[PDB]
């Protein structure tokens, strides 16, 4: 912001779409939050991780109960995948290049299958790809615009690489750490980006994903409290308790300036 005017970067947008669980996805989510495992979690008997990861998987796509055109990972069974399908169609008809992130390798494979189901020319880079080929791959996506979508895991696709060839960026799945998402979204808006970029951060409304978004907003506020200014507004959207298992789908100083600073600080 203090360098953007002195660097001639293009415009940026940071929209946050609140996606809607499908009937089948909503059914699986409601069945899980009504299951006995989450009940045991809320009683402190079991670790929270199983339920947390299960809910994140359900919001990503119902790959718990793998339900032709009914193969594993079919796009129409997940709301976020429906939104991604619409966005990819629009952007492809607009002749733009998209950077599709995911927290989960399995969800990245599902997105890859959905992309081959369409005619989109993709290019994938996750933790399994050999390191020696990663910088080449990036250069490929930065060089020829025939490649449309760049699939990424936020841990490898983020974190310092340059992907200015990408124009749109879509963060498919929120993470507990805000910084993962931040670096993933700044993979495109960098020195050398000659086109307007926008970030679409997909969350399922009233699910665990919205709660994770709230947790990481709280974390971002805590960070801004000490990085940019200490007048940060308190996080009031939620109390951040252990009720994220619920489905709530919508719808020289001369001793005087120094003494003054001492007096003012104590008064605070």
């Amino acid at each position: 912001s203090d360098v953007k005017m002195s660097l001639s970067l293009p415009d940026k947008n940071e929209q946050v779409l609140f996606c809607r669980l499908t009937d089948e996805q909503h059914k699986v989510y409601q069945n899980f939050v009504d299951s006995k495992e989450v009940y045991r979690i809320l009683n402190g008997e079991m670790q929270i991780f199983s339920g947390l990861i299960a809910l994140r998987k359900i919001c990503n796509h119902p790959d718990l109960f793998s339900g032709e055109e009914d193969q594993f990972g079919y796009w129409k069974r997940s709301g976020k995948m429906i939104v991604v399908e619409s966005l990819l169609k629009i952007w492809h008809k607009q002749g733009q290049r998209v950077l599709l992130f995911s927290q989960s390798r399995q969800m990245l494979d599902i997105l890859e299958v959905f992309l081959r189901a369409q005619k989109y020319t993709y290019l994938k880079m996750d933790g399994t790809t050999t390191i020696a080929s990663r910088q080449p791959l990036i250069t490929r996506y930065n060089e020829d615009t025939s490649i449309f979508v760049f699939l990424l895991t936020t841990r490898v696709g983020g974190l310092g690489v340059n992907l200015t060839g990408a124009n749109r960026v879509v963060i498919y799945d929120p993470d507990w750490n805000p910084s993962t998402d931040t670096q993933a979204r700044e993979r495109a808006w960098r020195i050398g980006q000659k086109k307007q970029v926008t970030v679409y951060r997909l969350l399922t409304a009233g699910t665990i994903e919205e709660k994770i978004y709230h947790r990481q907003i709280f974390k971002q506020f805590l960070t801004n409290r000490v990085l940019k200014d200490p007048k940060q507004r308190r996080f009031f959207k939620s109390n951040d308790l252990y009720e994220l298992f619920t489905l709530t789908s919508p719808d020289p100083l001369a001793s005087s300036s120094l003494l003054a600073k001492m007096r003012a600080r104590n008064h605070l």
Partner: protein, 363 residues
């Protein structure tokens, strides 16, 4: 001395000569004050004294009863006999009085409008001298043995605090930051003293028999560790390179800041080259101290240099660079805890466990 005046008038000798020679002669003629007295207000022993660096008029004194008394040393009366009256007092009725003994009190350098006091109540309080109210308090997890503000720093305003913790705390007056600590000691840090010459050089003496010099700006620990033998008994640095054979409970940079005087519980004082910590092997004989806490001793200034060390119930005056014993100032009834030197008139003020502050004036 008429020779000195004649040489000054005739330009034979620089007036510097007369000034420093007469300062030395006055210090040598130090004796129990004939016509001077100090008001008695401490119910317990005086652990520390500090005359303000600018104008040298007012003196702070912290007692073992926790009160802090502020005296005026100037003879505002017309008689030749006067008592150093107490201007102000953090007494037992003050809302912010220290709950336990005040062990170090220090005027803020560059200005007399503020002072600081550290106590065994685990607090370093910063007091506004005018309103006489605590401007700031810095709480510590363990009792404070000593503290010191840099007498030179126009840039930083750090207070180096030595507690029974093995860490030297650096409390920044600016943006109240007591988080900074220095690692490298192993037992209680009984004395701390900033270099009067170098802005960021701090000497710390701890009960592990070691004295360390730190550049507080630096990120790599202490600069120098003082070693008695300078290398004769050389070993990988885990327990060797000790400054003394006991607890080093007192530090004092010389007036120019080129040497460091360390007094330890092995009944020895040592003089160290402050630039590389080499022992100068000045003898000083046996300097009796058994204090379990910090020992406050000072050096002379503006003379042709002396060091005044508490020695039992006396003040031992030594020549810093030769070690020759000048004299014993003998007027206290119990062990002397502190002595502070008025450089303007070559005077001395000693506080001891007998609830007395005695003034020594040149005869």
């Amino acid at each position: 001395m008429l020779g000195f005046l004649s040489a000054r008038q005739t330009g034979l000798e620089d007036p510097l000569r007369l000034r420093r020679a007469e300062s030395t002669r006055r210090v040598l003629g130090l004796e129990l004050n004939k016509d001077r007295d100090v008001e008695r207000i401490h119910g317990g022993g005086i652990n520390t004294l500090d005359i303000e660096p600018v104008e040298g008029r007012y003196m702070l004194s912290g007692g073992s009863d926790g009160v802090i008394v502020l005296y005026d040393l100037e003879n505002s009366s017309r008689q030749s006999y006067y008592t150093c009256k107490a201007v102000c007092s953090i007494g037992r009725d003050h809302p912010d009085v220290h709950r336990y003994s005040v062990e170090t009190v220090q005027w803020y350098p560059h200005d007399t409008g503020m002072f600081t006091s550290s106590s065994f109540d685990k607090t370093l309080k910063v007091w506004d001298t005018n309103t006489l109210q605590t401007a700031d308090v810095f709480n510590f997890e363990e009792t404070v043995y000593s503290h010191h503000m840099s007498p030179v720093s126009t840039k930083h305003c750090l207070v180096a605090v030595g507690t029974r913790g093995p860490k030297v705390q650096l409390c920044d007056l600016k943006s109240g930051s007591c988080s900074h600590i220095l690692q490298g000691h192993r037992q209680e840090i009984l004395a701390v003293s900033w270099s009067p010459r170098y802005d960021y050089i701090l000497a710390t003496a701890s009960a592990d028999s070691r004295v360390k010099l730190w550049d507080v700006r630096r990120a790599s620990g202490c600069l120098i560790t003082l070693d008695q033998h300078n290398g004769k008994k050389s070993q990988a640095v885990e327990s060797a390179n000790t400054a003394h054979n006991g607890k080093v409970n007192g530090l004092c940079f010389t007036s120019d800041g080129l040497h460091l005087l360390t007094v330890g519980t092995d009944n020895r004082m040592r003089l160290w080259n402050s630039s590389n910590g080499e022992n100068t092997l000045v003898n000083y004989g046996k300097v009796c101290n058994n204090s379990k806490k910090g020992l406050k001793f000072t050096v002379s200034c503006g003379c042709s240099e002396f060091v005044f060390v508490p020695y039992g119930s006396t003040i031992a005056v030594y020549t810093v660079y030769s070690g020759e014993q000048i004299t014993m100032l003998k007027g206290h009834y119990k062990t002397v805890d502190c002595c502070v030197f008025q450089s303007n008139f070559q005077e001395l003020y000693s506080g001891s466990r007998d609830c007395n502050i005695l003034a020594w004036v040149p005869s």
